[PDB]
Paper text:
The LCs are composed of an N-terminal variable (VL) and a constant domain (CL). Even though full length LCs and other proteins have recently been found as part of fibrils, patient biopsies predominantly revealed VL domains that result from proteolytic cleavage of the LC as the main constituent of amyloid deposits. The patient variant (referred to as Pat-1) contains 11 mutations in the VL domain compared to the corresponding germline sequence (referred to as WT-1). To determine potential structural differences between the two VL variants Pat-1 and WT-1, the X-ray structure of both proteins were solved to 2.5 Å (Pat-1) and to 1.55 Å (WT-1) resolutions.
The primary structure of the pathogenic LC, named Pat-1, was deduced from the sequence of the complementary DNA (cDNA) of the plasma cell clone that caused AL amyloidosis. The two sequences differ in 11 point mutations, all located in the VL domain. We thus conclude that the Pat-1 VL but not Pat-1 LC is the disease-relevant amyloidogenic species. The crystal structure of Pat-1 showed that V81 is in close proximity to L15 and L82 opposite of the antigen-binding site. Focusing on the surface properties in this region, we found that these three amino acids form a hydrophobic surface patch which is not present in the WT-1 protein. In contrast, in the patient mutant L15 interacts with three amino acids located in FR3, including the two other point mutations in the hydrophobic surface spot, and two residues in the C-terminal region (V111 and L112). V81 in Pat-1 forms six hydrophobic interactions with residues in FR2 and FR3, two of them, the L15 and L82 point mutations, are located within this hydrophobic surface area. However, V81 contacts only one amino acid in the C-terminal segment (V111). Remarkably, when we performed fibril formation assays, we found that all Pat-1 point mutants except V81L formed amyloids, suggesting that valine at position 81 is the main cause for the pathogenicity of Pat-1.
Residue numbers in the entry:
A (entry chain A), B (entry chain B): 5 to 113
Write the structure that this text describes.
Amino acid sequence: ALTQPASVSGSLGQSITISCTGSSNDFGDYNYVSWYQQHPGKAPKLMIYDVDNRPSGVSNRFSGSKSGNTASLTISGVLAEDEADYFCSSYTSSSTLYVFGSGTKVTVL
Amino acid sequence: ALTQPASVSGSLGQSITISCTGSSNDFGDYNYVSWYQQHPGKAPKLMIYDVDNRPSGVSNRFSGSKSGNTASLTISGVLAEDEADYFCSSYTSSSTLYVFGSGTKVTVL
């Protein structure tokens, strides 16, 4: 179970951090965490993969880090279109399949 | 991109089929398409992986199949709790970016 905070709020131009906590040490040793941005209803878009790598066309405003048991997505210079659901995800044991975190609702004020 | 029908509706006890078509041949003959069930503002659950495999604890009402460049999730004996968003997903052909389909809103009447 990857646990995130239910919700976090931030004002335009401020910096918000979404934490992703896990029980086991498999992901916490090997850095296999990914971050998806989901606008309400639409497809989850990949923002970060392997802890801290951005696919081509993603704002450098989004950046990922990690510190043992918890990974973190930081969004700096928050815009209106950052209002969305955010999910962390690592691999299921001995597979390449993604299992998803509880998810964080981000409201932009 | 994996393109799905925007929405599908079915009555209780009926069968529902959701299609997942990909642009050209960018998804390695669609043998590694998975299917995720998502309740609103909730973590997407794995229902099917590798076209037709069912994880332990997933009802046998959910089954997957594939023909050419289209993968299909079928939900038998539709229950209330099948009312959800459904995304097909697969690695891009480069096997780094795990990309989600446009998504299908299943309404149960």
